[PDB]
Design a protein around this ligand. Sequence first.
Ligand SMILES: CCCCCCCCCCCCCC(=O)OC[C@H](COP(=O)(O)OCC(O)COP(=O)(O)OC[C@@H](COC(=O)CCCCCCCCCCCCC)OC(=O)CCCCCCCCCCCCC)OC(=O)CCCCCCCCCCCCC
Ligand SMILES: CCCCCCCCCCCCCC(=O)OC[C@H](COP(=O)(O)OCC(O)COP(=O)(O)OC[C@@H](COC(=O)CCCCCCCCCCCCC)OC(=O)CCCCCCCCCCCCC)OC(=O)CCCCCCCCCCCCC
Ligand code: BCL
Ligand SMILES: COC(C)(C)C/C=C/C(C)=C/C=C/C(C=O)=C/C=C/C(C)=C/C=C/C=C(C)/C=C/C=C(\C)CC/C=C(C)/C=C/C=C(\C)C(=O)O
Ligand SMILES: COC(C)(C)C/C=C/C(C)=C/C=C/C(C=O)=C/C=C/C(C)=C/C=C/C=C(C)/C=C/C=C(\C)CC/C=C(C)/C=C/C=C(\C)C(=O)O
Ligand SMILES: COC(C)(C)C/C=C/C(C)=C/C=C/C(C=O)=C/C=C/C(C)=C/C=C/C=C(C)/C=C/C=C(\C)CC/C=C(C)/C=C/C=C(\C)C(=O)O
Ligand SMILES: COC(C)(C)C/C=C/C(C)=C/C=C/C(C=O)=C/C=C/C(C)=C/C=C/C=C(C)/C=C/C=C(\C)CC/C=C(C)/C=C/C=C(\C)C(=O)O
Ligand SMILES: COC(C)(C)C/C=C/C(C)=C/C=C/C(C=O)=C/C=C/C(C)=C/C=C/C=C(C)/C=C/C=C(\C)CC/C=C(C)/C=C/C=C(\C)C(=O)O
Ligand SMILES: COC(C)(C)C/C=C/C(C)=C/C=C/C(C=O)=C/C=C/C(C)=C/C=C/C=C(C)/C=C/C=C(\C)CC/C=C(C)/C=C/C=C(\C)C(=O)O
Ligand SMILES: COC(C)(C)C/C=C/C(C)=C/C=C/C(C=O)=C/C=C/C(C)=C/C=C/C=C(C)/C=C/C=C(\C)CC/C=C(C)/C=C/C=C(\C)C(=O)O
Ligand SMILES: CCCCCCCCCCCCO[C@@H]1O[C@H](CO)[C@@H](O[C@H]2O[C@H](CO)[C@@H](O)[C@H](O)[C@H]2O)[C@H](O)[C@H]1O
Ligand SMILES: CCCCCCCCCCCCO[C@@H]1O[C@H](CO)[C@@H](O[C@H]2O[C@H](CO)[C@@H](O)[C@H](O)[C@H]2O)[C@H](O)[C@H]1O
Lengths: 60, 60, 60, 60, 60, 60, 273, 62, 39, 39, 39, 39, 39, 39, 39, 39, 39, 39, 40, 49, 49, 49, 49
Amino acid sequence: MHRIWLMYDPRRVMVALVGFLAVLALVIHFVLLSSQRYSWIENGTLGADQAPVGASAPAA
Amino acid sequence: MHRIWLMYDPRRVMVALVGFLAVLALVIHFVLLSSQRYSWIENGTLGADQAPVGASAPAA
Amino acid sequence: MHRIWLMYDPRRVMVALVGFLAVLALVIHFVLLSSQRYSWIENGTLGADQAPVGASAPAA
Amino acid sequence: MHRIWLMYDPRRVMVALVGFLAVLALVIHFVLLSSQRYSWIENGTLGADQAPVGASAPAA
Amino acid sequence: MHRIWLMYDPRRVMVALVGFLAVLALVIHFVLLSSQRYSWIENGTLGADQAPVGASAPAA
Amino acid sequence: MHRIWLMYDPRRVMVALVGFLAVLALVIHFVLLSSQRYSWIENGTLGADQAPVGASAPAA
Amino acid sequence: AMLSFEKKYRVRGGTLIGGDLFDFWFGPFYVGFFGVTTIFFVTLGTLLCVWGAAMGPTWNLWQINIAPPDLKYGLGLAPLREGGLWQIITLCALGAFGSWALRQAEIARKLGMGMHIPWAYGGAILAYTTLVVIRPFLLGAWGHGFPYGIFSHLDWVSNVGYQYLHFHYNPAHMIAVTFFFTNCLALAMHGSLILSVTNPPKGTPTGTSEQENVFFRDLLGYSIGAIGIHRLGLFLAVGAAVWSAICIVISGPFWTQGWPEWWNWWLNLPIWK
Amino acid sequence: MMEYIDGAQIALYAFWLFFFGLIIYLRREDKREGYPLESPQGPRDGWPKGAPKKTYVHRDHG
Amino acid sequence: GMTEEEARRFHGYMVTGTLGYVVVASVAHFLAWSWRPWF
Amino acid sequence: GMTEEEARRFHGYMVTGTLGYVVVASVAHFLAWSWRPWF
Amino acid sequence: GMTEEEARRFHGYMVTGTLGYVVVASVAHFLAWSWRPWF
Amino acid sequence: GMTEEEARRFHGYMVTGTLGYVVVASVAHFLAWSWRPWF
Amino acid sequence: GMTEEEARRFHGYMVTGTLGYVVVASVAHFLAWSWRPWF
Amino acid sequence: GMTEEEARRFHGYMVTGTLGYVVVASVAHFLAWSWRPWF
Amino acid sequence: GMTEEEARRFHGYMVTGTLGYVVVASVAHFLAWSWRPWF
Amino acid sequence: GMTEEEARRFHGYMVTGTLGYVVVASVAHFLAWSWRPWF
Amino acid sequence: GMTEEEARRFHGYMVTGTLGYVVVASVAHFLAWSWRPWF
Amino acid sequence: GMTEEEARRFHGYMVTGTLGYVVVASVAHFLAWSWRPWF
Amino acid sequence: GGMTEEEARRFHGYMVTGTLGYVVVASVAHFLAWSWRPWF
Amino acid sequence: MHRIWMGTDPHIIMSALGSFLVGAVLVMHIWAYGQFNWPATLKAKYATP
Amino acid sequence: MHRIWMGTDPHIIMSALGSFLVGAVLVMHIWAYGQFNWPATLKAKYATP
Amino acid sequence: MHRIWMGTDPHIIMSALGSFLVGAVLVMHIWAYGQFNWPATLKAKYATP
Amino acid sequence: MHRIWMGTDPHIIMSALGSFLVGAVLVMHIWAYGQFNWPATLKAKYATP
Ligand SMILES: CCCCCCCCCCCCCC(=O)OC[C@H](COP(=O)(O)OCC(O)COP(=O)(O)OC[C@@H](COC(=O)CCCCCCCCCCCCC)OC(=O)CCCCCCCCCCCCC)OC(=O)CCCCCCCCCCCCC
Ligand SMILES: CCCCCCCCCCCCCC(=O)OC[C@H](COP(=O)(O)OCC(O)COP(=O)(O)OC[C@@H](COC(=O)CCCCCCCCCCCCC)OC(=O)CCCCCCCCCCCCC)OC(=O)CCCCCCCCCCCCC
Ligand code: BCL
Ligand SMILES: COC(C)(C)C/C=C/C(C)=C/C=C/C(C=O)=C/C=C/C(C)=C/C=C/C=C(C)/C=C/C=C(\C)CC/C=C(C)/C=C/C=C(\C)C(=O)O
Ligand SMILES: COC(C)(C)C/C=C/C(C)=C/C=C/C(C=O)=C/C=C/C(C)=C/C=C/C=C(C)/C=C/C=C(\C)CC/C=C(C)/C=C/C=C(\C)C(=O)O
Ligand SMILES: COC(C)(C)C/C=C/C(C)=C/C=C/C(C=O)=C/C=C/C(C)=C/C=C/C=C(C)/C=C/C=C(\C)CC/C=C(C)/C=C/C=C(\C)C(=O)O
Ligand SMILES: COC(C)(C)C/C=C/C(C)=C/C=C/C(C=O)=C/C=C/C(C)=C/C=C/C=C(C)/C=C/C=C(\C)CC/C=C(C)/C=C/C=C(\C)C(=O)O
Ligand SMILES: COC(C)(C)C/C=C/C(C)=C/C=C/C(C=O)=C/C=C/C(C)=C/C=C/C=C(C)/C=C/C=C(\C)CC/C=C(C)/C=C/C=C(\C)C(=O)O
Ligand SMILES: COC(C)(C)C/C=C/C(C)=C/C=C/C(C=O)=C/C=C/C(C)=C/C=C/C=C(C)/C=C/C=C(\C)CC/C=C(C)/C=C/C=C(\C)C(=O)O
Ligand SMILES: COC(C)(C)C/C=C/C(C)=C/C=C/C(C=O)=C/C=C/C(C)=C/C=C/C=C(C)/C=C/C=C(\C)CC/C=C(C)/C=C/C=C(\C)C(=O)O
Ligand SMILES: CCCCCCCCCCCCO[C@@H]1O[C@H](CO)[C@@H](O[C@H]2O[C@H](CO)[C@@H](O)[C@H](O)[C@H]2O)[C@H](O)[C@H]1O
Ligand SMILES: CCCCCCCCCCCCO[C@@H]1O[C@H](CO)[C@@H](O[C@H]2O[C@H](CO)[C@@H](O)[C@H](O)[C@H]2O)[C@H](O)[C@H]1O
């Protein structure tokens, strides 16, 4: 596996990895922050039985 | 089959593969997250019989 | 038949073929997913007798 | 662990780190200040049970 | 810790620090001056009991 | 303390300082002149008991 | 501070006005007589903008709005709180922009350069002068100028366009837009080409004018060449501003109807009337 | 459920952080020639410090 | 460029790859047909 | 470039990594199917 | 680049950091799950 | 560039300063939680 | 650059200026607090 | 640049002038406060 | 790749593993049939 | 990688550990079956 | 990394620590069961 | 890093410090238990 | 760089003494606080 | 049978097997908690009414 | 059995094992508090009406 | 057992240990103050009707 | 035990320790004022109706 560090410079890879993780974490956090279920700054204290849930009915 | 890698630089193949898989994975997750049935962030706690379903052919 | 690979470099043709198949597959999935009958992400669980069918001749 | 500082120049990493922490702190403070629950400059004197809370799941 | 001044030229760090503190101070003053509770040029003479407070969560 | 002038050319510091103080003073005068309470060109002859004060919090 | 090669260039001479009197630098900046008049007008205009913000309803940067006078004041100066301030700021702006172009001419003369940069900037000054001087003068009131405010001037642009119902149909505007879009395309190609020969893939030799010329010729079918692409970029960028000046000066002073009905002449050509 | 924060605003600050990063990078590239500056107080670098001067490999013969 | 025997070796894998792909696609189509016929 | 025996060694890792990834993805689909079947 | 020695010892820290990161993330998910399940 | 002994001396300051910062931030969350818990 | 004795000397002023600044800011905050508390 | 003796001489003017300016400004605030207090 | 000698050893173990797997599955099916017959 | 000699030691432990895992798993199932029979 | 002599010595501590940990945990579960039986 | 001579000597204080810490906490828990027993 | 063995020896003795004094004074303060307003 | 190991690194073997065991065990337990109604019966036994 | 440690760094092992145990213990407690209704009964014993 | 310390800077060890304790102790006190209703009962003693 | 100080400057040690004590003591006092109703009972003695 370590031949990966011979194909690619670890100095270049580490920047790409941290860049990927930082973007991915920021994307996921703001997606949750934009939701109703997980908007934790406003509603984090609610407790799971009274946290919002998306509409059920396929019908009836 | 391994001689395919004599044609293509594996150092390029891995980047193209990761690029393809990342874009494909992101596309499919957002397609599902756009759907009614699989908006798991808002409605993931519904059971399978309570999740939305598309409209059947009319018979009413 | 193999002499086609003397006329055309297979390291080009393989990449062209993979690209063609990728775009073709993506188009056909997208056409089906947009349809009423085959919008499987929303209506996939419907039985074949319940799936939409497009109209008819209005033959009285 | 210390060999990271041979791969990267500590003069650059430390300025990158200071810049990152500066931006991140400002982002978190301004996100909080824009919220209802943690707009502390207007509402900081409210007790924890008086502070705004996001709306519950709908009940019917 | 004085060898931070061998990593970095103090003449440059002090200009950057003076710059940072000036911008930060002006930002915080302008945030407060934009607020209601701390609009001190208009309402500075009000008592602490009289200064604006942002609204609480409504009682059930 | 005087060795600060070995580090910085006083001829440049005095330029920076005069520039900073000039802009700061113009800022503070225009901020006050835009206020209701300290718009002294229109209202400077009013006594301090007569000068405007911003809105209190209402008591209930 | 000076660039490592700069000192031998810092000679006297080349001024238009003032001679040796202001022929000196301040940090990187060349001063000169038109530098002194630049700073005067910039300072006076900027502080009158801050005064305009102070007497307006907010310090919010996006919302500050120093508006021209009512049309009833015609070509006179209005009361300062009723749009006369916008008029004084406009004089400072004209003075600052003119001083900037003449200072550029003094700098270019000191370096033995051609006068291309001052005259290219003259294209932008022409558009500004059209918007606030020429078009309002032809309409007979300074109140036809646009307001000084980061978003309120976009409200003016919106409303002026809809004064002609469908401003896209303005024929000079179509040309001006085409120049702006063509300029941006040409700039992306010129930037890309120079960078791609000077920064080739690792281990490749530095490229050449011949490679640039060959590639460009596969893009457009013809070679533009080195001086040709800079002539083109200058023609496109300055022509965009000149056709902009034309498109706004014909809107109102010369054409008053909706712009779609201007195209009636094309429908009535005798070969197909 | 955040009322003030919305996706267009989030995107816009994402862009600003990229853009101010980009201006820094371009100002580093702009200093590959003529820097460090001469001054009566010795060399000066400005800010950011410039990227080093490039050396260009010529076409080996032709 | 390939030699003729180098090309004829490659051709064997290409045909096998194509047949494998068509087989997978056939099973997919037959699954899809049994789920929701299009004729 | 790359030698015959490097290309072979790389292939063994590549095949193992591809099939390993498909096995993890298969379990992900088994979990998804248990949670909310799409047919 | 670096030797195979250097690459192989770097890989040891890289794996260890990855494991540490996955561990913290796993605890974060179980805290999040017990606070507010998403299935 | 640093010698390894310089990197080792820097590393211990960098670790200590990071952990010191995290300790101060831990108190800041202790205070913020006491004033207005977010869960 | 600096010699380490110059770095040692400069640091003592820098720490004292930072302390003096933090002290003035501490009085400023306690004046502000007693005028109009923010918690 | 400057001699340290020249730095001492300038520092004398600089500190004195700075404090003189602050003294004039403190009187200006005394007058402004007497006319229209801001707290 | 694998020599004729290696292939001969490898085959004997592959046959052994396959038969072992089939034996275990034979017990599994006999148990399943006795629990819930499917024809 | 490994010699056959290293492989032959490793195989001995690998079989032993696998066997031990099965034995503990067998007790776990016997207890589970006693507690809640699933057929 | 570790020679066999380091590994042989390390293993004695690793095994002892693992045993000690399980002993403490066995007491913990005995007490927990006595307090609130879970089957 | 530390020699064995340092490591052996450091270990003795690290153990002694830990046992001091556990003893103090043991008294703390005995007092807390007598005050408010949590089982 | 930093304290030698014997500088550390001197420092530690004062460091121990200062810590002990601080704990002693805090012990007195807590006894006054307890007798003033007991908290258990 | 031991010659299957020869080309390998034993730390990769134990890493891969360990990852598989962790995965399979977690999947099995979370599945089993669904089917067997434990710990749900444990929770109900000590729940406050 | 000890030969498995050969070639490793003992600090790397103690980091990995330490990380795992902190994670495992924390998860097991967060889970156990949900199931056993403790400390919820503790809080109710001392809560003011 | 002392051989585990060899490669390590003792100041890093003491910094890591001390930081862990500060974190753990602060968490434990917030948690305990909530479960045990203290200082809340203390505050209720010395309060003005 | 004194050897822990070797390779450290006394001034960084006392700077950090003094900074810690200032922080800790201010936190404890502001906390304590909230619980013990002091100086609030002092204020109420001398307040004007
Ligand atoms: C969401 C909006 C999307 C919306 C959809 C948007 C899609 C846009 C895709 C654009 C991709 C551009 C990529 C590119 O230009 O690469 C340069 C290369 C030309 O350079 P070249 O030098 O001449 O190339 C030949 C060769 O010398 C290159 O060698 P190189 O060393 O540089 O490596 C490049 C290769 C690496 O090789 C491989 O990937 C092939 C390996 C084959 C292995 C076969 C398996 C055998 C072993 C078994 C185990 C194997 C284990 C793995 O990689 C590339 O760079 C190209 C990668 C494929 C690109 C696919 C493009 C489609 C992507 C679809 C994405 C859909 C969304 C997820 O040209 C191409 O790759 C052509 C791209 C394909 C175009 C096909 C034509 C489209 C026709 C459409 C008709 C549709 C209606 C019928
Ligand atoms: C809207 C989308 C498109 C918008 C498109 C906007 C594009 C704008 C691009 C141009 C902006 C940079 C201009 C520039 O580099 O001027 C040279 C000057 C000094 O460095 P130097 O030239 O390498 O070295 C000379 C100096 O060290 C010594 O010279 P000397 O001793 O002879 O003279 C005295 C010194 C005193 O220093 C100053 O006065 C500097 C004051 C700079 C204030 C303006 C900053 C604007 C930043 C805008 C970017 C963004 C800021 C947020 O040097 C001088 O006198 C130099 C005078 C330079 C005058 C430049 C005036 C430019 C005004 C531009 C206003 C643009 C408004 C949009 O540079 C600087 O002071 C630092 C500039 C750093 C680049 C900006 C990066 C900002 C990233 C975000 C914040 C980063 C925080 C760490
Ligand atoms: C080279 C010095 C070492 C160090 C050596 C010690 C020693 C020795 C002791 C502590 C102790 C403690 N350390 Mg430590 N500690 C270091 C770095 C840290 C860091 C960090 C972010 O880097 C943190 C959060 C801690 C945290 C802690 C606390 C858990 C505890 C007391 C408060 C304290 O230190 O406040 C923050 C203050 C600082 C970080 C400054 C440095 C430590 C100060 C000087 C300790 C003085 C008090 C001590 C008891 C005096 C010894 C004589 C006594 C009579 C026994 N240390 C540095 C790297 N630390 C004590 C303990 O174990 O209590 C249970 C203890 O005996
Ligand atoms: C609007 O209409 C809509 C709605 C869209 C409807 C209409 C749709 C229409 C019109 C569709 C048309 C479809 C079509 C038409 O032709 C489709 C044709 C498809 C074809 C041809 C598919 C072929 C696939 C072949 C594959 C995958 C081969 C893989 C090969 C592999 C893996 C081996 C690689 C080589 C190796 C390993 C050896 C190296 C050795 C070396 C190097 C050595 O030995 O040296
Ligand atoms: C909206 O919902 C949407 C978003 C749509 C849903 C979908 C989301 C999707 C698809 C997510 C996919 C995620 C993913 C997929 O793989 C995510 C992959 C994550 C991964 C792999 C993370 C890896 C982390 C690794 C870390 C942190 C390593 C740290 C290493 C350190 C610290 C040590 C460095 C080395 C040192 C110190 C030694 C130097 C020695 C040297 C130099 C020497 O010795 O020489
Ligand atoms: C939306 O959020 C919102 C609302 C915005 C809220 C959030 C705000 C946030 C995140 C704020 C963050 C603040 C912060 C974070 O670190 C702030 C950090 C601030 C800091 C570090 C301040 C430090 C100041 C130090 C000073 C002043 C030092 C002065 C030194 C002097 C005078 C001596 C100079 C030397 C001399 C004279 C000797 C020469 C000798 C020589 C040459 C010789 O001897 O040679
Ligand atoms: C539900 O509806 C639908 C789906 C339609 C229903 C229909 C389903 C259908 C049609 C199913 C078909 C299934 C099927 C076939 O037909 C399935 C076939 C299954 C098979 C074949 C299983 C084989 C297992 C073999 C094993 C486990 C071997 C293990 C070997 C081991 C352990 C030894 C390893 C090697 C060694 C030691 C040698 C190294 C020596 C070396 C290197 C040396 O000596 O050098
Ligand atoms: C929802 O219901 C669904 C999910 C659908 C239901 C279905 C589920 C299914 C189908 C499950 C299948 C599971 C399965 C199989 O198929 C599961 C297979 C499990 C297995 C194989 C476990 C094996 C464990 C082995 C262990 C623990 C070994 C430990 C060995 C040790 C410690 C020694 C290490 C080496 C040493 C010491 C030598 C060093 C080097 C030396 C000496 C040197 O180098 O010299
Ligand atoms: C609730 O629902 C779900 C979650 C599903 C429920 C299910 C949960 C499940 C499945 C749990 C499984 C848990 C598990 C396993 O499977 C758990 C396994 C735990 C283990 C292995 C613990 C081992 C601990 C070992 C320790 C503490 C050792 C310490 C050693 C020390 C201190 C000595 C230090 C010195 C050394 C070493 C060397 C010195 C010499 C040197 C250097 C020299 O000499 O050179
Ligand atoms: C409200 O809820 C929550 C917040 C949860 C509740 C709170 C909870 C907790 C957990 C609080 C924790 C507190 C704590 C620890 O645990 C607190 C620890 C405090 C400590 C360690 C105090 C130590 C003080 C030591 C002093 C003052 C030393 C002075 C030394 C002097 C003066 C000598 C200087 C040196 C000399 C003279 C030698 C020079 C010689 C030289 C140079 C030479 O000889 O060369
Ligand atoms: C609330 C604040 C909490 C503490 C904040 C963090 C800073 C603590 C500083 C005081 C404690 C001692 O902190 C310790 O300082 C010494 C030097 O003095 C540093 O030591 C550093 O330099 C010495 C030489 O001087 C090297 O031998 C050592 O390897 C290197 O790390 C340590 O890396 C740091 O851990
Ligand atoms: C890193 C160190 C600092 C980390 C700080 C970040 C928060 C960490 C919190 C972990 C502990 C949570 O601890 C939890 O606190 C809440 C606060 O509402 C307590 O809650 C209880 O006491 C508080 C006290 O004000 C009451 O307001 C509340 O109504 C009551 O339910 C819980 O009984 C306790 O279990």
